Amino acid sequence: AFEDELGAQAPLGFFDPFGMLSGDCTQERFDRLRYVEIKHGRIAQLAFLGQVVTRAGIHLPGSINYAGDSFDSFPNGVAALFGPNSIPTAGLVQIISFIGILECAFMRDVPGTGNEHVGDFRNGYIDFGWDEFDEETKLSKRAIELNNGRAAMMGILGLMVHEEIIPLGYDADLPIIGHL
Amino acid sequence: AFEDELGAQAPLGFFDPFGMLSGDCTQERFDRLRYVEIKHGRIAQLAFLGQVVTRAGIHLPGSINYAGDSFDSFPNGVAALFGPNSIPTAGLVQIISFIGILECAFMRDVPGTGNEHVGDFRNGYIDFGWDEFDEETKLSKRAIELNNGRAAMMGILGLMVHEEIIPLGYDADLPIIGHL
Amino acid sequence: AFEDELGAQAPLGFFDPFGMLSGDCTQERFDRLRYVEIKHGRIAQLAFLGQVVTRAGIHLPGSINYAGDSFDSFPNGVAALFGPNSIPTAGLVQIISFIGILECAFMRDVPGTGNEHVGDFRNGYIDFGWDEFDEETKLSKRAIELNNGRAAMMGILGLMVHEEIIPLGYDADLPIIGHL
Numbered sequence A, B, C: 001a002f003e004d005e006l007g008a009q010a011p012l013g014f015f016d017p018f019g020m021l022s023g024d025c026t027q028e029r030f031d032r033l034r035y036v037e038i039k040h041g042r043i044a045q046l047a048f049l050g051q052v053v054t055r056a057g058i059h060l061p062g063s064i065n066y067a068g069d070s071f072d073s074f075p076n077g078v079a080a081l082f083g084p085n086s087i088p089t090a091g092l093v094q095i096i097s098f099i100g101i102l103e104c105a106f107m108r109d110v111p112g113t114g115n116e117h118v119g120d121f122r123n124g125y126i127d128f129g130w131d132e133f134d135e136e137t138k139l140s141k142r143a144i145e146l147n148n149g150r151a152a153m154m155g156i157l158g159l160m161v162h163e164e165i166i167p168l169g170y171d172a173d174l175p176i177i178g179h180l
């Protein structure tokens, strides 16, 4: 039933190993799964962009504290949030609070606003020209977003794992990025 | 749609900053939110009453243990539940178990019993004369309960925060209640 | 309404102390409760069987690690999973991952497959002859499964509690099984 939905493309086609959509799956279940997948993909895309920017030597100009702790002095990766040399716990809690405010008020599907598909948070408020695209281009953009999100999920998991296995003696000369 | 419901009164009117009810919000969502708000308000009202009674020097007569630990020897506030001089862990676990029994059996909206609104746990079992009040008086009582609950939420949050910031050097001469 | 459902047997009859099905309880709520009860019963039956087999001196032949840690060297009970002499954390995490894979993909009620009642995971895939039984025998088998599951819930709780109270000085010469 969902073998022709978004995300079922070449070369794998419809790829449902664990069988979430097996049987007479309801549209609500697939909508929930696609919402979770798109949310994870967007978060992972942002996380991968952040690690790429930070690890390349690009840091915000200034100090993260009144104490003078410069932005470009903190480590990259999980060591920047959780560790002995991480950013202050106040900064992490404020970041989490901002993300929670976004979750509750901003990055949500408001019913009866004009949203067209799962993951559309536009809400008739912030539109950059979605209606300019025709249907085929719209589907292509949605598929690109979803697949880049899956790739970012895998990449961010790999980056965190590789950073975490370095103290254990598992230091890998990763391609392109190099040593973490 | 919910701008004329209970709790939207002077001077703020309908106050929905985070936009929980924005858009075509369903009645189920508002009922869930109002249930959570009323439950929190009742819990916080009881918590503030407990704070006032305990901090005023009124303690239960006797001892909380067979070992002879008197009721009036334990501290007030968070130090009475979680701390080195708190009540015995068995007492806290029994309190939590009693509250869970209440949650699962007593303080619940039993369907098909005669409940009139969200937060009405009466269940046609314990009534002190609710039907004696007229509709306007009923609405006034419900609004009083809700607003006192919100005030108690903020007050209990303030009391816990002020108790917790005292060891950090943030001791404030609070009005009325004084030093915690 | 649910006083004649499965699980209401002599001598207790319909036993609903906490009043979970009191009032106009929907079939969905009873179905959820029965699903949870059957799942817990099956898990507890497996846990009791495994703990009895392990405590009887029957262990898998070989070693659980490449390091040579034999199966019959680990303790019995909670000390085998969580403790200073437990199985390796890798083994526990892999067991949890296998159970999660089962939860997600295998031990589930796939809609539109032919399942006849709550707790039926057969899904028209693995059938040993369920249709051979008549209606009364089917009800008897389901009731036996449910009641043995409740008995196993109590038994596994008792086994874990008795194992945990031994270091505290509460060592009980339990009947049949003896000292844990």
Ligand code: CLA
Residues within 6 Å of the ligand: A043, A046, A047, A048, A049, A050, A051, A053, A054, A058, A059, A060, A061, A064, A071, A072, A074, A080, A081, A087, A126
């Ligand atoms: C998962 C996302 C994520 C997370 C958790 C972090 C976390 C962190 N970043 Mg970071 N970053 C990210 C994405 C992320 N970043 C992206 C995508 C970029 C590229 C622009 C950067 C660029 C960046 C720089 C240049 C620096 C950091 C730094 C830091 C650290 C200090 C916090 C700070 O100043 O943030 C700053 C965050 C930003 C500048 C960009 C955040 C953008 C977010 C993800 C937007 C997402 C919500 C957005 C409002 C949605 C808009 C919707 C639209 C319709 C309006 C902290 C560990 C600093 C550091 O290393 O100090 C220790 C630092 O110097 N980051």
Ligand code: CLA
Residues within 6 Å of the ligand: B043, B045, B046, B047, B048, B049, B050, B051, B053, B054, B058, B059, B060, B061, B064, B071, B072, B074, B080, B081, B087, B126
């Ligand atoms: C959030 C609610 C709450 C919580 C968590 C606590 C927690 C505590 N209180 Mg306390 N207390 C509360 C509310 C609360 N109280 C209220 C509202 C009052 C005013 C009557 C008191 C009066 C009070 C005294 C006088 C003493 C305590 C003490 C204590 C401590 C020991 C436990 C004990 O003996 O409880 C005793 C609890 C009570 C005497 C009253 C509890 C009543 C609860 C809130 C009823 C709520 C559910 C109820 C069944 C609903 C009925 C619905 C109706 C339709 C039937 C413990 C830290 C003792 C202490 O400090 O020793 C260490 C102590 O001496 N409390």
Ligand code: CLA
Residues within 6 Å of the ligand: C043, C046, C047, C048, C049, C050, C051, C053, C054, C058, C059, C060, C061, C064, C071, C072, C074, C080, C081, C087, C126
């Ligand atoms: C709650 C269930 C449960 C749990 C958590 C454990 C946990 C454990 N068992 Mg164990 N065991 C169980 C049930 C369980 N067992 C049952 C039911 C039996 C009887 C066959 C055994 C027999 C057994 C032996 C003989 C040994 C262990 C050992 C161990 C320990 C090492 C892990 C291992 O080798 O597993 C091995 C697990 C098994 C041999 C059987 C597990 C079978 C599971 C329960 C199947 C459940 C799902 C299944 C696929 C459903 C199929 C449905 C069907 C339609 C296809 C570990 C603490 C070993 C030990 O103590 O070394 C430290 C050991 O030597 N167990």
Ligand SMILES: CC(=O)O[C@H]1CC(C)(C)C(=C=C/C(C)=C/C=C/C(C)=C/C=C/C=C(C)/C=C/C=C(\C)C(=O)C[C@@]23O[C@]2(C)C[C@@H](O)CC3(C)C)[C@](C)(O)C1
Residues within 6 Å of the ligand: A044, A045, A046, A048, A049, A148, A149, A151, A152, A153, A154, A155, A156, A158, A159, A174, A175, A176, A177
């Ligand atoms: C004005 C304003 O405020 O906002 C607007 C601005 C604008 C532009 C309109 C908006 C937008 C669009 C945005 C932000 C789009 C972002 C898209 C983004 C960020 C897309 C890539 C993600 C990451 C991927 C694919 C990672 C793959 C990672 C992969 C495939 C790996 O496995 C990788 C790997 O590393 C390992 C682990 C090991 C090494 O071998 C190295 C490599 C690399 C191989 C917003 C959102 O509307 C907000």
Ligand SMILES: CC(=O)O[C@H]1CC(C)(C)C(=C=C/C(C)=C/C=C/C(C)=C/C=C/C=C(C)/C=C/C=C(\C)C(=O)C[C@@]23O[C@]2(C)C[C@@H](O)CC3(C)C)[C@](C)(O)C1
Residues within 6 Å of the ligand: B044, B045, B046, B048, B049, B148, B149, B151, B152, B153, B154, B155, B156, B158, B159, B174, B175, B176, B177
């Ligand atoms: C027979 C039996 O068993 O039961 C029946 C008995 C009976 C009577 C019928 C029943 C009832 C009704 C009850 C229990 C009603 C209770 C109502 C209650 C308990 C109502 C106030 C709450 C707290 C508020 C408003 C706090 C505000 C706190 C505020 C506004 C603050 O911010 C405060 C502040 O402190 C700071 C943090 C700093 C300092 O500057 C000091 C102050 C104070 C300014 C029940 C429930 O049906 C059960």
Ligand SMILES: CC(=O)O[C@H]1CC(C)(C)C(=C=C/C(C)=C/C=C/C(C)=C/C=C/C=C(C)/C=C/C=C(\C)C(=O)C[C@@]23O[C@]2(C)C[C@@H](O)CC3(C)C)[C@](C)(O)C1
Residues within 6 Å of the ligand: C044, C045, C046, C048, C049, C148, C149, C151, C152, C153, C154, C155, C156, C158, C159, C174, C175, C176, C177
């Ligand atoms: C081919 C393949 O791969 O799979 C198939 C194989 C097969 C056979 C078809 C299948 C099956 C059926 C199975 C596995 C059925 C299992 C049934 C099972 C395991 C049934 C008892 C549970 C435990 C009870 C009742 C415990 C009570 C415990 C009680 C009553 C206590 O309180 C006890 C106690 O200890 C205390 C705490 C203290 C002491 O005084 C000692 C005692 C004992 C008194 C499956 C599932 O379809 C999978």
Ligand code: KC2
Residues within 6 Å of the ligand: A064, A065, A066, A067, A087, A088, A089, A090, A091, A092, A094, A095, A096, A098
């Ligand atoms: C996530 C987004 C975000 C938002 C929306 C946001 C809003 C506000 C507002 C509201 C207008 C104020 C008034 C405010 C004030 C301060 N912020 Mg924010 N802040 C955010 C993020 C961070 C991070 C990451 C850090 C940080 C800090 C500080 C410090 C320094 C305190 C000090 O130096 O003792 C002060 C005074 C740093 C800190 O925590 O220092 C321990 C630091 O690391 N903030 N901040």
Ligand code: KC2
Residues within 6 Å of the ligand: B064, B065, B066, B067, B087, B088, B089, B090, B091, B092, B094, B095, B096, B098
């Ligand atoms: C929340 C409500 C509540 C209920 C409904 C409830 C019911 C019962 C019943 C059932 C009829 C019994 C039989 C019972 C028995 C004991 N209770 Mg309760 N008890 C409640 C609350 C507390 C608190 C707060 C404490 C406490 C204690 C004890 C001790 C002392 C043990 C000891 O001194 O070794 C014993 C023997 C104290 C304790 O935990 O001491 C470590 C203590 O702090 N109990 N209790």
Ligand code: KC2
Residues within 6 Å of the ligand: C064, C065, C066, C067, C087, C088, C089, C090, C091, C092, C094, C095, C096, C098
């Ligand atoms: C729950 C079911 C389950 C499944 C489905 C499953 C699948 C696979 C697969 C996939 C085909 C591989 C390739 C694989 C391989 C290894 N397993 Mg499994 N394994 C399961 C259970 C356990 C347990 C309980 C233990 C264990 C272990 C090891 C070790 C030893 C590593 C070492 O000696 O360093 C290796 C190499 C032991 C261990 O973790 O040792 C620290 C141990 O305790 N495994 N295992």
